[PDB]
Design a protein around this nucleic acid. Sequence first.
DNA 1: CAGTCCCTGTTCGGGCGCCG
DNA 2: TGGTCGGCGCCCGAACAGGGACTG
Lengths: 413, 554
Amino acid sequence: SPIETVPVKLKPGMDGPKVKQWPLTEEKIKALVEICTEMEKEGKISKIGPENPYNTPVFAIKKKDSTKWRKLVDFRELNKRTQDFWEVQLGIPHPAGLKKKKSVTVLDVGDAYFSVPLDEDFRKYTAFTIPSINNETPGIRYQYNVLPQGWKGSPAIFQSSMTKILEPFKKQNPDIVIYQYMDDLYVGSDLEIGQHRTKIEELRQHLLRWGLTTPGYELHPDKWTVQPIVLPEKDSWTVNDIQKLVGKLNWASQIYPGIKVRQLSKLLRGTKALTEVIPLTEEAELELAENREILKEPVHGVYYDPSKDLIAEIQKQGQGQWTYQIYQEPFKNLKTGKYARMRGAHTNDVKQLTEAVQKITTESIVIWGKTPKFKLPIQKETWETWWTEYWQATWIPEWEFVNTPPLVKLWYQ
Amino acid sequence: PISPIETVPVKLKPGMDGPKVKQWPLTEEKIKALVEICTEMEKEGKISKIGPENPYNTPVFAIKRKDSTKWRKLVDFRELNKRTQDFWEVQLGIPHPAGLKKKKSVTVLDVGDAYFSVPLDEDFRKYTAFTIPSINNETPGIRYQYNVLPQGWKGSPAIFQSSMTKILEPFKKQNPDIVIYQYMDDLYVGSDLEIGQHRTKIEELRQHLLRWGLTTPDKKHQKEPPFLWMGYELHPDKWTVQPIVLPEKDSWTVNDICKLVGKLNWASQIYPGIKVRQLSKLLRGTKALTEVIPLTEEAELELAENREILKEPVHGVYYDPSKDLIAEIQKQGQGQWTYQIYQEPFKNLKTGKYARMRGAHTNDVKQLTEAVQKITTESIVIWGKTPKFKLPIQKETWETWWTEYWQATWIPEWEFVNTPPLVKLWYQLEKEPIVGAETFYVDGAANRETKLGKAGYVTNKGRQKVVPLTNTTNQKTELQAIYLALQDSGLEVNIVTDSQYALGIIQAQPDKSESELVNQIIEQLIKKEKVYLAWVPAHKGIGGNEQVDKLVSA
DNA sequence: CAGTCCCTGTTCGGGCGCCG
DNA sequence: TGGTCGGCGCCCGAACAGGGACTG
Ligand SMILES: C[C@H](Cn1cnc2c(N)ncnc21)OCP(=O)(O)OP(=O)(O)OP(=O)(O)O
Ligand SMILES: [Mg+2]
Ligand SMILES: [Mg+2]
């Protein structure tokens, strides 16, 4: 039975994942269970017991009014422990050709990894447990025999095979760039939606009569600018009205070591009435339009070092106003932007915050070949409570929570 | 007897050996019963004698059960446990009577010599070696080892629950319409069958179990309403907890207070409005759980109030999936809250409290959401659903806080319940300077190594002040300072600051803090009819800034 | 930069309750 | 005399953590 289940090992002296399963919904467990039932009747998973001390949380989520549930596992804690197996030994070359792509299209193919018997000596790590409503029964467990979706190695071990599956359509359309992250596969071109879409329809007929099966959806992150750090446009300035533009530009200075202060700082050297109006002199009045130019001139100190992880910061402004700060170093913002609620029914805070973590992450991948490490503006318990509700990316960025006051939002606001 | 189910494979922590501790002496009473048990166990095959060739041994003992001529043979496998591999606990929590749906027929079975029916893997047995002492203190104690899950071993629980499911699996699979709440060896079998047809299925189950090595002797509740299950009393249309007696005593020690709060916490699932903040608070000074502690008035009371609630009899109803799930919360004062989850008014399924003070500077809306959280999670756990809420907070007060809070906060579908105390922001902050208002430039500081420091302000209409603080710190000053600029101002003020530690605390509209100073800063803020607080960078010489620091920098 | 302070969050463990 | 195990809840302290403010 000459198959080729590549061996895999965890980094030096590092135990496997041992995280607890978290509460699900009737609707989610009924699905997660109808799924596993099938997944096992085809030996992709195998019931296992207490003796296996590793665990990973899991659940499902619906997608695109397709009303088709899809399992998902938070392998994050594993991917961090599954050795450089996917880093130092099997990396992925930055296909920067994507950034520029007129029209990219994301397509989930991982539904194929389920055809690649996984190293048995490692399966014991893919352990996950389904729970019961009101706790009527103990946790039914499982393991993986094939490749686990949403895992780091899972796309790696397979890319060797993928590539070859692509040479036909990939050598006959070299213009198009094709990238693979986790379970998803990105296809960037330049043709107009009329034909560009009709072409993706061909990649399909190629991949289905080759095994794979995949059930606006497009993207062009570059065809949308980083929105600059704008300033006010008034013709009368109060004491605080100024003290603001000051303190703001004071910190907005670290993003530009060259940004004038004194000319607008001079205007007050005594305890003045905040309400008091005190227009400006032509020099400081020229500064407002000068320091104002440095805010159209892209920062200088940015180098995408793949050697470190992309962090990210986010702000909650007003009426669906959220902002991006993707950076690897403090003040060294490699890229920023925003996300507002669309002309559809109004959603809530968290539903958005999440969408505003998926979008920022989707870009992040196309622009750097990886995902950030979001610093979140929500309360853990709150986040951990509803997030799984409004998610649909078949991956999961790492994240942390931070509670920090604003006025430092004035800058992106 | 003993079951044919597949034994579970067990290893030891890499490079470790078995236990070898000696049998610390036991009474002549226990021994009389251990040898009485072992004889039966050995005769039955649950254990076997062992000779010199077995180099291990662990100490054992026995306990008496509630109203039982019966003893419980235990083993002090504390040592082995460490040396044993670790498992993944399969039990994820506990069932709640208020999650059971109303059934037409209910039964409760309890497997006998549960653990002792499931085999222990052939190779691990060597370690389960123990010795039964001789009382005439002569004959070398008899040595045996386990052939079934020994009581007190780190893994038996997970193995038993695991095997149990595996055993029930086929039955469950062929009788999908029959519910079977299993918890260890306890089985609650629910059905929507008539007495007749259900009692037949309850028989088939029993036989299947027996056939699979599991006995269901008559400790089997039948036309037993009220059934005794999980520490409750299950009646045809209501359920309730069992007699939950508190201790009435003279002087209280710490473990006493522990027991009290423990039980009270346990009663809070059905008896509404139990509260423990003051009784617990009485346990901050870490000490001997034998050390006598004096009760505070604020606790003496809440004890007695509680003690009262526990007198009126109460109960809860079962779940009806065809109806909506409602949960209402009420403010019980000083951080505490109480809630109940019902479906039909006054007939609630469960009740509960929330008294965690997350933070050092928060308000009652922060807490109110902290609770809506707990109640969702919890409610999902039991019903796998999320409640519709009824809240003591204006449908506006809310649209105010979230639309103005820097953090995304959320509440599920909910409606207002005008049933005060009501929840509300005790004050707001003008987010725009206030005309004709003495604008105060405030600041302060203190010396790192020395004792004191100080803080003060200045006005835009000509006014100066400063105060000599003591043992303060870089932060204890900015605040201590904004404190004066309040009393030393009036209905309308405009304070300015360069510190963020203080602008941050205050911008959250906090109405409750751990520090006395903060509270005073709030109290005052409530009295004013207009206040504004803007921030400006420290040590960047800004109009009005430097003067203040000077007056203090000394 | 360090070397510290404050300050605020978070995790972990322990004690008790309840269940088997 | 007392002494065991697993799950979950509560509460408390201890131990970390991370920022901002100063100082060397
Ligand atoms: C061993 C299992 C769980 N268990 C119950 N109590 C304990 C304890 N104190 N220590 C360890 N495990 C415990 O007991 C189930 P239990 O029902 O309490 O006892 P049993 O051995 O099944 O015998 P019987 O049916 O006649 O009542
Ligand atoms: Mg029993
Ligand atoms: Mg200051």
